Structure 1
């Protein structure tokens, strides 16, 4: 709980054996996170053990992520620039599922962890027609 480099950096998962970085409540998609996401193991987990992260909710059973896989080293799995590509839906957040590939595998969850959007946290605000006609129709399509 207080075995992290800094204050309030880690949070508990639905599992008593793991802890992970606190994620921004809302972020922009495909944008690097403010902090390096980590998954800390309380129990003994060998160096090299893989750890993956999957994001999802009612909108996206599973959301496209980038760098969602890291290797455990010294009880800690440090993801390098984990990113969220898939969005979570208006007013919705993703739950993260952390799978630590020990044998047998161990699953840890971080519910309502983060909302992903395109902007992210933002500051408050016969007959034949011609080209011109064809281009105009094409410019409206959407």
Structure 2
């Protein structure tokens, strides 16, 4: 699969596409990479951040770190971001202490996935 930067350069995640439909089987499932050696078993949740509806509804939002690569069976975005607006989704790693990498302009969550208008 293909990766992208984060706001924490210790972790990276999937290229979640520009604009997608409210609650779809993602076109590429969500990989989250541990460069810093993480105990393969640690939990990773995500929280969709946006000035509008600050905590959107998500599904299979929790995942397990395994071989330094936490994968989400199939994450799904339900709570819509709004017009032009995307999610600065937060990414938690359950450790002592836990760590987060913010991720601005992640994905635009509308009811239609971008049809040919």
Whichever structure has more helix as a proportion of its residues is: 1
Per the TM superposition, whether the score is higher than 0.5 is yes
Q: Mark the structure with the bigger radius of gyration.
A: 1
Give the aligned CA root-mean-square deviation in angstroms.
Answer: 1.0
1:139 is matched with: none
Unaligned ranges ≥5, structure 1: 1-7, 124-142
Alpha-carbon distance, 1:15 to partner: 0.3
Deviation at 1:109, TM superposition (A): 1.3
Q: Deviations over 1:23-48 (max 9, x none)?
A: 01100011111001011010010011
Counterpart of 1:67?
Answer: 60
- Greater than 2 Å deviation, 4+ residue runs: none
Q: Quick one: distance in 1 between partners of 2:12 and 2:104?
A: 13
> Partner of 1:111: helix, strand, or coil?
coil
Indicate the residue corresponding to 1:11 in structure 2: 4
Distance 2:53 2:38 in 1: 31
- Cα displacement string for residues 49-87 of structure 1 (whole angstroms, at most 9, x for unaligned residues): 000011121112111000111000011100011000010
- What number of residue pairs does the alignment pair up? 116
Tell me the SS of whatever aligns to 1:43: coil
